[PDB]
Amino acid sequence: RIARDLHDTLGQKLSLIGLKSDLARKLIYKDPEQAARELKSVQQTARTSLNEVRKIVSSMKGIRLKDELINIKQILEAADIMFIYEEEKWPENISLLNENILSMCLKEAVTNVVKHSQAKTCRVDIQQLWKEVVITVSDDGTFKGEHGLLGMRERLEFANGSLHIDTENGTKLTMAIPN
Amino acid sequence: EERQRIARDLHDTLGQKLSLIGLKSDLARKLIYKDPEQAARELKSVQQTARTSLNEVRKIVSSMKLINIKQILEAIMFIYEENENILSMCLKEAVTNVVTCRSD
Ligand SMILES: Nc1ncnc2c1ncn2[C@@H]1O[C@H](COP(=O)(O)OP(=O)(O)CP(=O)(O)O)[C@@H](O)[C@H]1O
Ligand SMILES: [Mg+2]
Ligand SMILES: [Mg+2]
What we know:
The structure is a homodimer.
Chain A: H1 2-27, H2 32-61, H3 65-79, E1 82-84, H4 96-117, E2 121-129, E3 132-139, H5 148-158, E4 162-166, E5 172-178
Parallel strand pairs in A: 1-2
Antiparallel strand pairs in A: 2-3, 3-5, 4-5
Bound molecules: phosphomethylphosphonic acid adenylate ester and magnesium ion (2 copies).
PDB class: transferase
Keywords: four-helix bundle, GHL ATPase domain, Kinase, transferase
Assembly: dimeric
């Protein structure tokens, strides 16, 4: 996973930084022009490696719940669906990891609204109850069915939480996760 | 805090090594003609830092992914007589540092 990306994209860059380096050395007196070229190559590869790092560190830190909310506001307004959120007391101390899980889920949910729902409006509820945080997303558009969905289910279930789908007044997704 | 530790270490050591590869590379370039033996020295320095980054990636990977302490002690006599993450990592470092040990 994280290991294959690290080892591969980053590994291959770093390996290459060494090889090109060593080549440019071999050419300092025989072909200084070609040493020079080789090293701009080195610097370009090193810069992009820094990008790779950025990305990896970003996945592993996890998206924050708050930031995911902000994001879904943006997304729905861009799809012209109306964003309703009656703000209430914030989740006590949810896991840093569980909070990512919720953010990822909420993401794919809201996405499915802008994609299939034909919805006018979309409600988002975040509430802390018992020793578990539950987020609800409903949308007033007809359900189109009966990847992403089974995905939420599983992420959330290895988590020890659950997912429900209700297609009576649209599609109301309910994710719950322990802390 | 474990994915948080890992993101942090990756960004730390690899952040720095890659900037250094940046700057040194750029220097050797500046020196190809005005000072080639120095350009060469600089570049050996770049290769070495690429090596050590490869090592660092290698090790972090190893943290996500006892016989070993025994033969590492051999190569200095040791005694032993018989959460997983924290305990194995911490004992590994413990004996790396001691390199008689039942704890030495
Ligand atoms: N809010 C919604 N309104 C209406 N239908 C929905 C819906 N959310 C999901 N669906 C239905 O579920 C189907 C598949 O959902 P899922 O998210 O698993 O796949 P998808 O079609 O979004 C592509 P991906 O697998 O890349 O997400 C859709 O084709 C659609 O019929
Ligand atoms: Mg989908
Ligand atoms: Mg030590």
